[PDB]
Design a protein around this nucleic acid. Structure first.
Ligand SMILES: [Zn+2]
Ligand SMILES: [Zn+2]
Ligand SMILES: [Zn+2]
Lengths: 497, 276, 162, 286, 267
RNA sequence: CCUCUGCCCGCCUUUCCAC
RNA sequence: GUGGAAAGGCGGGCAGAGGC
C-alpha cells in the first residue's frame, strides 16, 4: 500500500532472495552436493544437477513439501515454489546424432513445471477446506489476514498495527547500508530477523562477528572475515541506491526532489527479449552454465557500473537532459537475471534507459536485445498502482515488436512505443535545436496542433505558427513526423519546469 | 429493510457560465474513451450535502421537534477540540476536514442530513437513500462535438501585484457555457412517514446550488449551473415484482426548483401521497 | 527549380520557402495554377488534398506581391459571421453574399498604385468560387471553401508575407 | 447447451467486474427486499438443487467474451504445429497471457483447436481523484478511487442455466431492482447501475469427463487444473472471512461446487455462493 | 469553526461600457463566448479589479481601523518586494508568483480582516472561503438584437497596431451574490463592497485604460435579500430593495439604511 | 505589432468488523 | 443476504504594464 516506503520495497526484493537461497541450500546439503552443482540461480529460477537414487527423490519430496507449506502459512497463496525433476541419463548431457538431446531433455522438464504452476497448492490437503478461523484482522501495508489480533505496533506510527513480518522488513530495510551479507542458521537463535522455509537468517553487519554455519556474502568473491569452519556462499546482487544524508536509502521524495524540471518519480521496468530461445542452442551443461552467468553478471554487476557512468566509450552519446552526475539518484529495487525494475528521478532514469540498451547491445555481440517500460509518476503514488502500470506499459512495448522503448488513433497501423534507434535519431535532430527563450506557447500549442492529427488541417496551422515568430529552421518536415515528435517535445518541456 | 418504492428525478443540468471540475493545462475531467466532459456523481452529491449541512447548522434550534437527535449538537465545528463526537455539529474528522456524519444508526435515523445522504459509525451505519448518477452531455451536445464545434475552452487568468502591476498568468480549462447535461437522482423510500421531508430537503439543497456554484472557481464565476427538470416517476414495490409499467409519473417539463419545491409539492406529488 | 521541384501534392512545400525570400522562376510556374483555379469554377470539385496543395501555389502566387492584411481581414471576418449564423441561427445568407462580393469589388477599386497585380491576383482566383455560394446550401459546398479560406492565408506567412 | 445471457448495459462506472459470489449476494439482497426472509431461503434451495449462475464477463457489440480455459495452457505447443519457430514463440505467449476469448474462439479452445485472442479489451480501469472538504473552511483531503469505465457499446453479462420458473420468479425481478440500485461499492455516486436485457445464448461444447467452470467454485475435491482466487467480501457491515475460490476456466472433474454458509452475528445467516458452472472440455494427457 | 448561513443578498444590474471596452486574451482579441462569439466581462476579471482597488484603499488606512476590524495589528503599510518573507508586518503578504497580494494566512485572522472576509482568503492548514461570488457578465438582450441585425459590437482601433475594443455604449449583465454568514457583520460587508464599486467608476476596467478604455458605469436593477425561509419554500417572499434609478454613489451614500431597513425585518 | 512574465501552495487516504 | 458504508478536486489569484 502507500504506507510502505522504498526501504521496505528494497527489503521485499532482498527477502525473496533469501527464500530462494534457503531452498537451494537445503537441496545441496541433504543430498551431499556442493555449490558447483547449482547451474544457475537467477531470479527465483534455479537448476541443480543431482543423482538419481531412490534416496534423493525421497528427500526432495520432503523439501518440496515443507517449502510449500511454509509459503502458505506465511503468505496466503501469493508466492508458490514449483520444483520438478527429470531423470536424465548420461548420454543426454550433450549432442548426439544431429538432435540436441540436452535441450530436448530440458524442455521435458519445463513442461513438468508448466503443468505445476497451474496446480498451485496441490499438496496442502486443507487448501479447499473452509475451516472457520475467527477474529481475523488485516495488515495495512501488505494485505494479510492475521488471526486473533497479534499484530505488532508499527515502528513508524504506533497508532497503526502491522503484521510481524513487516516490522522485520523495516528493520532489515534500515540495515541495508551496513549489511555485508547474512548468516544462515537455526530458526530459534539470537539475531535472526527473517525466516526462510528451512533456516533462520541473521544479518551479518559490518562491525560484528559472523555467526552461522553458512554465510552468504553479497557482491564479493572474497571470504574475508568468515570463520575457518563456516561455508562460503557468494551471491551477487544489483544494489545501487542513492543515499540520504543520514545513513540510509533515499526516499521516494528525496530522490525526486533532485530531478531537474518538474518533480516526478521515474520508474523503469524491462527485460531481455526472447531469452528462453537463446538457452536452447546451448547443448552441453558447460555451455548453459556459461550463457547463464554472463547474462546474470550483466544485470547484477554490469548495471551498477553503468549507473556510475563508467565506459561511455562503449555507450557514447545518449539522450541526456543534463550531463550525467557523479552520484546519481537512482534506486535499483529488483535486478533479475533477464529483467530489472529500477526507480529514481524522471530525469536520470530516462538517460539510464539508453545507457543500458547501448551497453547491453555491446555486452552481447548484438544478437540479444532489450525492451523497456518507462514511467512518470507523482512521488506519493502507491507501488501496486505504479508497478501494474509499468508492467503493462512494458508489456505494451513488447507485444508490438519486442525491441522498443516506451517513453511517455484507433486504427491499428500505429503503435505507442518508440523503437530504440528511432528515438535516438529523433533525439539527435529535434532536441539539439530547442535545448526559443520562454517561447513555450510555440511548444505547447504544437502538441495541441499534434492532437488534431490523431482525431491535414495541422500543416498550415503549424506553418503560420512557425512563421508568426520566425522559426523556419525548426521543424521543416513538420509542415508521419507529427506523430513521432511527441517523445522529444514532451520530455524537453518537462526539463524546463 | 422495509423497501417500499424508488422515486426517480430526471432533469437537465445546464451550464449558464463555464463549468470546471478539475482532474490534476488544467483539465476538467473527461471520459477516457469519448473524451467529452462530464459531471460526476460524487461531485454533485457532495455539493448538495455540503450546502445542506450548512443549512441545518444554522437551524439546530427550530428543528428539534421535527427532527430528533438535533438537540445533541451545538452549532459549529469540533476542529478546536481534536475529539470526534463532541457536542458540536461537525463531528467526524475524515482526514483533516470535519464533516457532520452521525455516530450511530438510531441517531442517523433522526438527523435530517444523515437520513438522506447516510452515515458511518461503529455498531452499524446508515446507507444513503439517494443515488446521484453521473451527468453526461445530452445528445444535442454530442452532435455539436460530432459536428466539429468546441465543447471546452481554455481561459487565461492572471494574478497582479497591486503596487508594481507585475502579471503572472495561469490558464484554466473550463467547459463552454451553454452545455446541457442530463442528471438522474434515485431516492429510496425506506420509510413511508418521511419521504416528503427527504424530497423537500433534496429540493432545498438544489435551490441553494442554483445560487451557489457547482465546482471549480465559482467565487470568480465558474458555477452558475441551472436545474431543469423533466419528469419524476415513483416506482412502486409491485412494479419491480412484475415489470409492468404501472408507476406514477409527475410530469413537469419546464419548472424551476422553487416552482416545484413549494408551488407544486402537494399539487404534483398528490398521486405519490396516495399509493405510499 | 522552375517547375521541377514543385509538383502536384507535397513535393516542394519545404524547399520553396528559400526561393520565395525567384522573380522569373515564380512568374511562369505559379501562373498555371492561377489559371487552373480559374478553370476550377466548381469549388467542391476537390474532396482530396488538391485544395491544400493548390493553396501553396496560390500563396506563392501571392508571395512576391503585396497582399495587405487590413483589406484581407474585413472580407474574412465577414466570412466567419456567416458561419456563426450557421450554428442554429439562420439558413439563408443570400442577402449577405451580395455584400460579400461587393467588398472584394470595393477592395480592388481602392488599392491603387503599385498594388495592382497584387489585388488582381486576389481578384483572379476567388471569383470562380465567389459565384458558387449563391445557388448552393451551407451545410455542404460552403464549408469546403471555409477550409480553403485560411489555407492560402497561412502559407503566405510561411513564404515571407504579412 | 442453451443458456440465458442477461446483459447489463452500464450507466456509469462499475467498481469491478462482478464475480459470481457478488451476483448471488446482490440477488439475495434484492429478493430479501421485494419479497422477504421467507423467500431468500427458497432462492438458495433452487441453486442448491438446481440452477446455476456464472460470473460476469464483458461484451462489446455482439461479440461476447468468455474466460480462456486453462486446458489450453499445456497443449499450446502441440496446438500450434502449423507455424515456424519465429512466431511459435510470439503466438505462444500472447495466447497465454490472454484472459478472454470470443464466443467463436472459446468453442475452439474446448476442442483443442487453434484460436486467436481479442485485439482490444472492452473496458479500462482508471483512478479518479476524490477530495473531502471541511464544511467550515473547505480544507481538502484528497484520496484516489479506482473504477471500471466502459467503452461506448460495451457492458457486462452473466449467464444462467436452470429451470425457467426460477428465472422469472427470482432473477428477472432481482435484476430490475439491481438495475436501479446498482452492483458493487459506491452505488451512491452512480456506480454499479445498469439497464437490463435478456437473450438466448448457445455455446457448443464437446462431451467429455472434465468440464471448465465459469464461476468461482468452492470445490469439495481437488480439481484438475486450477487458479486460486483468495477473496472474501462484506455483508451488512461485517467483514467476511477470506475463502479460497477457484477462478473461471479451472477444470474440475464432476464436482458440484458447494455453498458455504456463515454466521457473522446477523439475525439471519449468510450463504456464500460457490457453485460451479460446467461446460465440457477436451484435455490432453494430464 | 462555526460556518453558518442566513441568506444571500443578490445584487443584479447592468454594466454600461461608456467608453470602448477591452479585456483581452490570446489581432489582439477580446475574450468572447466560444459558443455565441460575443464578448463578456469575466467575473474573475471583475472580482480582481474590485479587490485591486479595495486593498489599496485598505492599504492607506491600516492605522485607524484596527479597533473596528482587529487582526490589523499584524500589518504595517507596505509590501514584501523589499525582503522575501511570505509573512512579515507588511500588508501585501502573499508571494502569488512574482507579484504580491494581501491574503491572511488562516481562518481566524481573516475572520477579522475586512478584505479577506469579503473576497476570500487562502492558507496552509485552515483557510477561509469567499462570501461574494461574481458571475461572468454577458451582453444584455437588446445588444444581442444589434448583433442579429448588423450593428457593430466590436471595432478594430489602429493604435502601428490594433487594440480591438467592445464598441462604446454597449451594455453587459452582471450578477453579484453576497453570502450572509453572520448577522452581526453584514452591513459592513455590503458597505465595503459598494465602496469597492465606487472606486471602479473612477478607475477603469480591463485593457490599457489610462488611454481611456475604461469608464465602466453600473446601472442597478434590484437588490434582493433571499432569506433562508426562501430556500425551504419556493414562494417569492423575499425582500426586493428597488434602486432602479439610483447610482452606486447614492446607495452607499446617506440613503443606505433607508434602503436596508427591510433586511433588518428578517435579521 | 513590439518588451518581462507562461501555476502556485497545500492535503495525497480517514474510520468502522459483533467471541 | 453486494471488497462494503460515509467522503464537493478545492481554497485564494484584474491577460496587464508602457506603445498618439
Ligand atoms: Zn504486512
Ligand atoms: Zn446526521
Ligand atoms: Zn486579510
Amino acid at each position: 500500500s502507500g504506507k510502505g516506503t522504498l526501504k521496505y520495497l528494497r527489503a521485499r526484493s532482498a527477502y525473496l532472495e533469501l527464500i530462494g537461497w534457503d531452498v537451494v541450500l537445503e537441496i545441496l546439503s541433504r543430498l551431499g552436493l556442493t555449490r558447483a552443482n547449482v547451474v544457475f540461480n537467477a531470479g527465483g529460477h534455479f537448476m541443480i544437477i543431482a543423482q538419481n537414487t531412490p534416496d534423493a527423490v525421497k528427500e526432495l519430496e520432503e523439501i518440496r513439501a515443507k517449502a510449500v507449506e511454509w509459503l502458505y502459512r506465511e503468505f496466503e497463496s501469493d508466492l508458490y515454489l514449483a520444483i520438478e525433476w527429470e531423470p536424465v541419463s548420461g548420454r543426454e548431457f550433450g549432442r548426439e546424432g544431429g538432435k540436441n538431446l540436452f535441450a530436448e531433455a530440458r524442455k521435458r522438464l519445463k513442461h513438468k513445471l508448466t503443468v505445476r504452476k497451474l496446480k498451485r497448492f496441490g499438496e496442502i490437503k486443507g487448501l479447499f477446506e473452509h475451516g472457520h478461523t475467527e477474529r481475523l484482522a488485516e495488515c495495512p501495508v501488505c494485505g494479510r489476514e492475521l488471526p486473533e489480533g497479534k499484530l505488532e505496533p508499527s515502528a513508524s506510527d504506533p497508532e497503526t498495527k502491522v503484521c510481524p513480518t513487516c516490522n522485520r522488513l523495516v528493520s532489515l530495510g534500515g540495515n541495508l547500508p551496513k549489511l555485508l551479507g547474512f548468516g544462515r542458521t537455526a530458526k530459534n537463535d539470537a539475531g535472526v530477523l527473517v525466516e526462510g522455509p528451512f533456516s533462520g537468517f541473521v544479518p551479518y553487519l559490518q562491525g560484528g562477528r559472523p555467526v552461522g554455519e553458512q554465510i552468504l556474502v553479497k557482491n564479493t568473491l572474497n571470504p574475508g572475515e568468515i570463520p575457518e569452519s563456516a561455508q562460503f556462499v557468494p551471491y551477487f546482487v544489483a544494489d545501487y541506491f542513492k543515499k540520504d544524508p543520514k545513513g540510509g536509502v533515499a526516499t521516494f521524495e528525496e530522490l525526486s526532489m533532485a530531478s531537474t524540471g518538474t518533480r516526478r518519480l521515474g520508474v523503469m521496468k524491462g527485460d531481455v527479449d526472447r531469452l528462453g530461445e537463446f538457452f536452447s542452442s546451448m547443448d552441453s551443461p558447460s555451455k548453459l552454465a556459461t550463457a547463464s552467468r554472463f547474462m546474470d553478471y550483466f544485470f547484477k554487476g554490469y548495471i551498477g557500473a553503468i549507473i556510475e557512468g563508467k565506459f561511455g566509450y562503449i555507450i557514447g552519446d545518449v539522450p541526456s537532459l543534463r550531463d550525467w552526475p557523479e552520484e546519481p539518484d537512482i534506486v535499483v529495487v529488483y535486478a533479475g537475471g533477464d529483467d530489472f525494475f529500477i526507480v529514481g528521478a524522471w530525469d536520470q532514469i530516462f538517460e539510464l534507459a539508453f545507457r543500458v540498451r547501448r551497453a547491453f547491445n555491446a555486452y552481447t555481440g548484438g544478437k540479444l536485445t532489450l525492451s523497456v517500460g518507462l514511467g512518470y509518476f507523482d512521488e506519493r503514488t502507491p507501488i501496486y498502482r505504479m508497478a501494474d502500470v509499468v508492467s503493462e506499459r512494458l508489456d505494451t512495448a513488447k507485444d508490438e515488436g519486442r525491441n522498443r522503448v516506451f517513453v511517455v488513433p484507433l486504427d491499428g497501423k500505429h503503435k505507442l512505443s518508440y523503437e530504440w534507434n528511432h528515438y535516438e535519431e529523433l533525439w539527435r535532430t529535434y532536441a539539439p535545436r530547442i535545448y526559443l527563450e520562454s517561447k513555450k506557447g510555440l511548444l505547447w500549442k504544437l502538441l495541441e496542433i499534434r492532437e488534431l492529427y490523431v482525431r491535414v488541417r495541422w500543416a498550415y496551422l503549424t506553418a503560420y505558427l512557425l512563421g508568426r515568430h520566425g522559426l523556419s529552421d525548426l521543424f521543416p518536415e513538420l509542415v508521419q513526423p507529427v506523430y513521432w515528435v511527441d517523445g522529444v517535445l514532451k520530455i524537453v518541456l518537462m526539463a524546463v519546469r | 429493510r422495509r423497501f417500499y418504492g424508488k422515486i426517480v428525478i430526471k432533469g437537465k443540468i445546464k451550464a449558464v457560465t463555464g463549468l470546471h471540475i478539475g482532474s490534476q493545462a488544467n483539465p476538467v475531467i473527461k471520459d477516457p474513451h469519448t473524451g467529452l466532459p462530464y459531471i460526476p456523481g460524487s461531485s454533485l452529491k457532495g455539493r448538495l450535502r455540503s450546502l445542506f449541512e450548512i443549512l441545518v447548522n444554522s437551524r439546530l434550534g427550530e428543528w428539534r421537534e421535527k427532527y430528533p437527535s438535533l438537540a445533541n449538537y451545538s452549532p459549529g465545528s469540533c476542529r478546536p477540540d481534536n475529539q470526534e463526537n463532541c457536542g458540536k455539529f461537525f463531528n467526524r474528522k475524515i482526514n483533516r476536514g470535519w464533516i457532520h456524519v452521525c455516530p450511530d444508526y438510531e441517531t442517523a435515523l433522526a438527523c435530517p442530513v444523515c437520513r438522506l445522504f447516510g452515515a458511518s459509525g461503529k455498531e452499524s451505519n446508515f446507507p444513503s437513500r439517494i443515488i446521484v448518477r453521473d451527468a453526461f452531455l445530452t445528445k444535442e451536445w454530442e452532435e455539436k462535438w460530432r459536428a466539429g464545434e468546441a465543447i471546452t475552452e481554455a481561459k487565461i487568468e492572471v494574478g497582479i501585484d497591486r503596487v508594481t502591476s507585475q502579471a503572472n498568468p495561469r490558464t484554466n480549462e473550463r467547459v463552454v457555457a451553454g452545455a446541457e447535461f442530463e442528471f438522474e437522482i434515485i431516492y429510496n423510500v425506506e420509510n413511508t412517514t418521511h419521504w416528503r421531508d427527504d424530497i423537500k430537503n433534496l429540493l432545498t439543497a438544489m435551490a441553494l446550488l442554483e445560487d451557489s456554484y457547482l465546482g471549480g472557481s465559482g467565487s470568480r464565476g465558474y458555477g452558475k449551473v441551472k436545474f431543469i427538470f423533466d419528469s419524476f416517476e415513483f416506482r412502486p414495490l409491485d412494479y419491480y415484482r412484475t415489470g409492468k409499467d404501472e408507476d406514477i409519473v409527475s410530469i413537469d417539463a419546464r419548472e424551476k426548483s422553487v416552482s416545484d419545491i413549494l408551488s407544486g409539492f402537494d399539487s404534483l406529488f398528490s398521486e405519490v401521497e396516495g399509493k405510499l | 527549380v522552375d517547375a521541377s521541384r514543385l509538383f502536384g501534392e507535397s513535393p516542394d512545400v519545404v524547399g520553396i520557402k528559400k526561393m520565395l525570400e525567384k522573380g522569373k522562376q515564380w512568374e511562369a510556374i505559379q501562373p498555371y495554377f492561377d489559371n487552373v483555379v480559374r478553370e476550377a469554377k466548381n469549388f467542391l470539385e476537390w474532396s482530396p488534398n488538391k485544395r491544400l496543395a493548390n493553396a501553396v501555389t496560390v500563396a506563392a502566387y501571392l508571395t512576391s506581391q503585396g497582399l495587405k492584411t487590413n483589406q484581407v481581414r474585413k472580407i474574412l471576418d465577414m466570412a466567419r459571421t456567416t458561419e456563426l449564423k450557421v450554428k442554429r441561427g439562420e439558413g439563408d445568407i443570400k442577402d449577405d453574399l451580395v455584400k460579400m462580393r461587393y467588398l472584394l469589388a470595393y477592395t480592388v477599386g481602392k488599392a491603387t498604385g503599385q498594388s495592382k497585380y497584387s489585388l488582381d491576383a486576389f481578384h483572379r482566383i476567388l471569383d470562380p468560387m465567389l459565384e458558387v455560394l449563391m445557388g448552393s446550401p451551407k451545410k455542404e459546398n460552403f464549408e469546403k471553401f471555409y477550409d480553403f479560406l485560411q489555407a492560402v492565408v497561412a502559407y503566405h506567412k510561411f513564404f515571407g508575407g504579412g | 447447451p442453451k443458456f440465458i445471457a442477461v446483459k447489463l448495459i452500464p450507466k456509469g462506472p462499475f467498481r469491478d467486474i462482478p464475480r459470481a459470489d457478488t451476483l448471488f449476494g446482490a440477488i439475495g439482497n434484492a429478493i430479501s427486499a421485494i419479497h422477504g426472509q421467507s423467500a431468500v431461503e427458497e432462492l438458495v434451495d433452487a441453486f442448491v438443487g438446481g440452477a446455476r449462475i456464472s460470473s460476469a464477463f464483458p461484451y462489446s457489440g455482439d461479440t461476447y467474451y468468455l474466460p480462456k480455459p486453462l486446458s489450453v495452457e499445456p497443449a499450446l505447443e502441440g496446438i500450434l504445429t502449423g507455424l515456424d519457430e519465429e512466431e511459435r514463440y510470439t503466438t505462444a505467449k500472447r495466447l497465454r497471457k490472454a484472459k478472454y476469448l470470443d464466443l467463436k474462439n472459446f468453442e475452439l479452445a474446448l476442442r483443442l483447436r487453434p484460436f486467436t485472442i481479442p485485439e482490444e479489451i472492452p473496458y479500462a480501469r482508471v483512478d479518479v481523484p476524490r477530495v473531502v472538504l471541511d464544511r467550515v473552511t473547505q480544507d481538502s483531503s484528497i484520496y484516489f478511487w479506482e473504477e471500471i469505465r466502459f467503452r461506448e457499446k460495451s457492458g457486462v453479462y452473466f449467464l444462467y442455466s436452470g429451470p425457467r420458473e426460477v428465472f422469472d420468479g427470482y432473477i428477472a425481478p432481482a435484476m430490475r431492482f439491481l438495475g436501479d440500485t446498482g452492483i458493487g461499492g459506491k452505488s451512491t455516486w452512480g456506480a454499479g447501475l445498469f439497464e437490463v436485457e435478456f437473450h438466448e445464448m448457445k455455446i457448443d461444447a464437446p462431451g467429455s469427463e472434465y468440464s471448465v467452470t465459469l464461476s468461482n467454485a468452492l470445490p469439495t475435491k481437488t480439481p484438475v487444473l486450477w487458479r486460486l482466487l483468495r477473496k472474501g467480501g462484506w455483508s451488512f457491515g461485517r467483514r467476511k472471512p477470506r475463502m479460497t475460490f477457484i477462478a473461471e476456466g479451472s477444470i474440475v472433474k464432476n464436482d458440484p461446487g458447494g455453498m458455504e454458509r456463515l454466521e457473522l452475528g446477523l439475525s439471519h445467516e449468510v450463504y456464500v455462493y460457490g457453485l460451479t458452472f460446467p461446460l465440457g472440455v477436451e484435455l490432453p494427457e494430464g
